Structure 1
Amino acid sequence: ARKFFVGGNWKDNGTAEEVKKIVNTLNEAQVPSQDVVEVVVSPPYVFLPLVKSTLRSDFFVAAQNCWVKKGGAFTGEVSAEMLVNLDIPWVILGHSERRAILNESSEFVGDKVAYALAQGLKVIACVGETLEEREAGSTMDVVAAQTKAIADRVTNWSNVVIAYEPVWAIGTGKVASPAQAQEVHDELRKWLAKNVSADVAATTRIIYGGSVNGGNCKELGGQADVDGFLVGGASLKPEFIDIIKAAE
């Protein structure tokens, strides 16, 4: 069985005092065993050492991005080998905000995934379609093309988790049902089975990166092809613990 996976993307949020309170609340949390849930939290770069040094050892830390290749003459970027030096085990790559606002192409994201895995990082690789893409009938064309650019560059999927972001439901007045989430996760898994292998399809976690809260987390988590969540704003709040508890 695929181990349920809950990632918390803090995005570009936090002060030293807020980070201490978030970490304390996570450290005091009582959640399902390590055997049935894997928990990753993702602070901004400036808080990676602080969170790694203070967070309970059974929760894991992710960076929110990294650079595409070996560091040295890229002002402002953080290399995969720098994250490995700091003992940060995970990285989020291809988040919808970076694809749309910073124009990260599918091939650029795929090159980042390959380089991060080569350096020993575990990767949350994000895919997802816009409302214009969904309304054009292009959901699976887009999600397959994004996934293919990663798959063409990945020789081992053990340390990859795919996150589906329903960008079409993010600030549009459109809402995604559990059935709509399940349909995309099923079709993406079927794509992996045909384009990579049956074994990779069966073993790769595909997590939901839409609106997740205490209200909806059990119905979403219980879908056949949903293996957990990439949480946004609730990741800063005690509600994140209720979302982890969907693994029960």
Structure 2
Amino acid sequence: HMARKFFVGGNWKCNGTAEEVKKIVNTLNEAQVPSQDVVEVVVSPPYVFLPLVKSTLRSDFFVAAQNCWVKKGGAFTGEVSAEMLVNLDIPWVILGHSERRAILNESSEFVGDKVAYALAQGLKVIACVGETLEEREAGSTMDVVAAQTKAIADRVTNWSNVVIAYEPVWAIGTGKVASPAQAQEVHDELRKWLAKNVSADVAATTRIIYGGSVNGGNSKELGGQADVDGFLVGGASLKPEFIDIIKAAEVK
């Protein structure tokens, strides 16, 4: 029924010092962006800076962890449980990021279990999907994205607190450039998959955000697409340019 609220997530990845975090947070705190009714803004620092960011960031921007454990805490040295994030009043978590799928070998099932467990503790989830250059060149884009999405869908009963991020991994460090039209094509096919395989209502209300290369310059052209509901920003999330990407929400 109601329009999907534009969503901008900033994934800091494995970057930051206390000094850099203070500079980034000060820059965001002084930013003048569209209303909380027009855009939902989430910033995702490394685990060790979650307390500093949550304590100092403007209350109308929300904090995400970059990962959490698949289940209840216990004998999992080095892992952070969903209930720890809830305990520290961290409302969001990024799960299934292409870097964790590729470098740390997180399976679609492992990601699905994490999403279900995070939602069960009351966290909101940015659930990431995306195909490699090999998969795209093989003609497997929608087979891979549908399979990643299905592993999540099979474990999720309530999509209200889920945002899906499409990462064109094929266009990240390969020399290949994703067009806005190519982004819109995958977002459209993914939403049609949700409509047929979950429900018309879930398809209509679930934000699908673009996790490819976005800057101030291309944000309105990418953002001004029928099935693109915002961005999961990588490196630019550390820079003032992030504010220009948030401002792309006015295109809707």
Normalised TM-score (structure 1): 1.00
CA deviation map 1:65-123 (0-9, x unaligned): 00000001100000000000000000000000000000000000000000000000000
Shift of 1:247: 0.5
SS class of match (1:207): strand
Partners of 1:229 and 1:106 lie apart in 2 by 21
2:206 corresponds, among 199, 204, 207, to: 204
Partners of 1:177 and 1:11 lie apart in 2 by 24
Shift of 1:15: 0.3
Partners of 1:53 and 1:226 lie apart in 2 by 31
Match of 1:25 in 2: 27
- Structure 2: unaligned runs, 5 residues or longer: none
Partners of 1:236 and 1:105 lie apart in 2 by 28
Partners of 2:144 and 2:218 lie apart in 1 by 26
Shift of 1:202: 0.1
Residue correspondence of structure 1 range 58-77 to structure 2 within 5 A: 58-77=60-79
CA deviation map 1:130-152 (0-9, x unaligned): 00000000000000000000000
SS class of match (1:53): helix
> Identity over the aligned pairs, expressed in percent?
99
Partners of 2:85 and 2:172 lie apart in 1 by 30
Partners of 2:10 and 2:72 lie apart in 1 by 27
Shift of 1:159: 0.1
Match of 1:183 in 2: 185
- Structure 1: unaligned runs, 5 residues or longer: none
SS class of match (2:125): strand
Match of 1:92 in 2: 94
SS class of match (2:116): helix
Partners of 2:240 and 2:171 lie apart in 1 by 24
4+ residue stretches of structure 1 with deviation over 2 A?
Answer: none
Partners of 1:178 and 1:7 lie apart in 2 by 18
Partners of 2:132 and 2:217 lie apart in 1 by 25
CA deviation map 1:121-179 (0-9, x unaligned): 00000000000000000000000000000000000000000000000000111000000
Partners of 2:61 and 2:248 lie apart in 1 by 16
Shift of 1:63: 0.1
Shift of 1:37: 0.2
Partners of 1:88 and 1:72 lie apart in 2 by 20
Shift of 1:237: 0.2
Number of residue equivalences: 248
